[PDB]
Design a binder for this molecule. Sequence first.
Ligand SMILES: *O[P@@](=O)(OCC(C)(C)[C@@H](O)C(=O)NCCC(=O)NCCS)OP(=O)(O)OC[C@H]1O[C@@H](n2cnc3c(N)ncnc32)[C@H](O)[C@@H]1OP(=O)(O)O
Ligand code: NA
Ligand SMILES: [Zn+2]
Ligand SMILES: [Zn+2]
Ligand SMILES: [Zn+2]
Ligand SMILES: [Zn+2]
Length: 531
Amino acid sequence: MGSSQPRKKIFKPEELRQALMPTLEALYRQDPESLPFRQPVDPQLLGIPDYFDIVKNPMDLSTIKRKLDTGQYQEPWQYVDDVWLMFNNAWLYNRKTSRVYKFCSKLAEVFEQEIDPVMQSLGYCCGRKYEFSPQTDTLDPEPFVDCKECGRKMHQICVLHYDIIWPSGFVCDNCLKKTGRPRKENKFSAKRLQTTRLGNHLEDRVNKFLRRQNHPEAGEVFVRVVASSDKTVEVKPGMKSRFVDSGEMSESFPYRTKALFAFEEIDGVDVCFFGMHVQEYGSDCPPPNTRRVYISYLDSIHFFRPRCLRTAVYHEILIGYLEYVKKLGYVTGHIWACPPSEGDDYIFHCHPPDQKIPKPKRLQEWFKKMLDKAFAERIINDYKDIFKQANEDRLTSAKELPYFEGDFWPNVLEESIKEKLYATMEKHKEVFFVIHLHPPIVDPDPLLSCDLMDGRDAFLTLARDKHWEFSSLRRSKWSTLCMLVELHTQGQDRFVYTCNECKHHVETRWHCTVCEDYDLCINHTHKMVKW
Ligand SMILES: *O[P@@](=O)(OCC(C)(C)[C@@H](O)C(=O)NCCC(=O)NCCS)OP(=O)(O)OC[C@H]1O[C@@H](n2cnc3c(N)ncnc32)[C@H](O)[C@@H]1OP(=O)(O)O
Ligand code: NA
Ligand SMILES: [Zn+2]
Ligand SMILES: [Zn+2]
Ligand SMILES: [Zn+2]
Ligand SMILES: [Zn+2]
């Protein structure tokens, strides 16, 4: 296996030592925390024959200092990787309550805030050793990539490099200030996802809302509908033979499901922070589902900036949804406020460890607060929970309850035929909402075939494979970076162009500077370029 990198950056021992050992010194100065670490662990002094069967590679301050003094480190990452082995040996062998487990953690905390700046003016991203959170003994490591001119290794996630975006390879940031080069534009951006009138309504709505507070840290939000597709919900086999063979409810119900996500600009790059799947039952769907929308799933990662605006924006999105479908012609909407099972994530592959999953009452209350200003903003006229609504309308048949795909009710009914039930309704009153917003329906928006977001399973699965975690701000940015590459490139629709006056087909064409999607034939107010 041969090596080439003609003008590599090589660090001479004194360069490395002179820069890196200010950091080792900070660790030695921690008294008493550092004293079990100034020496290699001696299992016969400590009475733990355990150790070398458990820790297959001991490491300690003294060893790292001698490696540093003799020059056994060629690249700084080897120095960094050795102390993390020292910490990792500590955190492993010892119980999470040990004294030296803690000592270590204080040492880890100081090495974290010392190594990052040093490694940065050595031209590197951080001085951290990163590994992906466990899946179903081993962890997978964060990827690295090497600058095409430096040869110096950096965290793929730290510098957000992706070959599909920049196919000429990765080149570092100061080798571009010396190249005179600025980095080519990332054209695979959340904003540049295909725009739709639904998506525009919600981003246009929250955007000046955020200006309504004008907090300095706020950045742009892009809302995009990334998948849209006509589906049919089959009536499940219990109610199957008892209501449709009779002919009182339909065999299937046609709906249009959409998946839609919201992104914010953080540190200059798209971060995805909200996702939702809806079911829209139009005006030719027969009773009981006619003119009804339903929120299958909703999920969130909390890194929205600033956090004192976070939830407000979730609401304005939801508010904007009912505002949008009201006008298109929908009349009632239906929420099942059920908080995530397990450590089961609804949409996003791996939530932050310290993001709290609400108690159902908290989420119920949340949805009630959300609804209260839809009423007040003159948007919906009111809303009840399912019983102050079911028997206000005096429902008595099992066939009158809206019948949605994957909803609770189709399956409680499903094997209540197998074996009473108005009681199983009334226990779960506050988890199911019914929203009154108020001539056929028209979805102006086209259909977006994008299998990845055709239901929540495709996206979760692919992130698990590819370690697109939403665990931290930095991992969030990286899996947004790649989520968007998947949406842009391997979506299932490719585009025929039309010229807005001529009805006609175009390939050669002129496009407006500012119009949302406006081309016109060579065969007007706007500045146009030839595309
Ligand atoms: O930040 P929120 O407005 O998030 C609302 C969401 C519904 C988007 C969110 O909860 C989410 O990501 N849900 C994922 C799955 C889901 O909701 N599925 C249902 C689809 S119908 O508000 P939260 O409700 O998340 O919490 C706000 C504050 O309350 C604290 N908190 C949440 N959960 C808690 C539990 N179990 N115990 C104690 N406190 C809990 C959070 O820390 C939040 O407080 P801050 O001061 O903002 O940190
Ligand atoms: Na342990
Ligand atoms: Zn890094
Ligand atoms: Zn470089
Ligand atoms: Zn024309
Ligand atoms: Zn025009």
